[PDB]
Design a protein around this ligand. Structure first.
Ligand SMILES: CC(C)(C)C(=O)CSc1ncc2c(n1)-c1cccnc1CC2
Length: 150
């Protein structure tokens, strides 16, 4: 597999589970942190002691709450940021879970509207599968940011 570790920001990369298995590319991009946004995929390289792994144990379903993990993900992204290392956030094909988290990060920490952040991510990673539940959670999150509640 030819991994596509999509650079959203200089240190923030988006990919699927085949991308997350490409050890050589991950090391070449100075990635030091991995967020696995799934309940069931391996921490593929855990036993090599190369990356700081975090699991956000979410399914790609119409009932899954991802909003509950946003702040945890943001803190870990800021750790990689301040450490000068890259972070890969991934789930499965179509990246619905990991792209939602990236979009939320852009909204809160780079002052983007939800629509602009979605279009920004889709401009770099053209295939993003729909999850209407996650769309609604981004919309509630946008409303909360605009009301100063988060
Ligand atoms: C939530 C997630 C990122 C997994 C997706 O569902 C991607 S697919 C898709 N399809 C149609 C729309 C949107 N996303 C969408 C998302 C955010 C803001 N505005 C839109 C406009 C309609």
């Amino acid at each position: 597999h030819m991994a596509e570790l999509t650079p959203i920001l200089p240190f923030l990369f988006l990919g699927n589970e085949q991308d997350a298995q490409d050890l050589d590319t991950m090391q070449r991009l100075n990635i030091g942190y991995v967020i696995n946004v799934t309940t069931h995929l391996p921490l593929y390289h855990y036993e090599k002691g190369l990356f700081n792994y975090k699991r956000l144990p979410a399914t790609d379903s119409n009932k899954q709450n991802l909003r509950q993990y946003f702040e945890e993900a943001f803190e870990f992204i800021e750790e990689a940021h301040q450490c000068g290392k890259g972070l890969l956030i991934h789930c499965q094909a179509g990246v619905s879970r990991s792209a939602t988290i990236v979009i939320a990060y852009l909204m809160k920490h780079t002052r983007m509207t939800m629509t602009d952040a979605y279009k920004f991510v889709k401009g770099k990673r053209p295939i993003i599968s729909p999850n209407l539940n996650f769309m609604g959670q981004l919309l509630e999150f946008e409303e909360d940011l605009n009301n100063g509640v988060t």
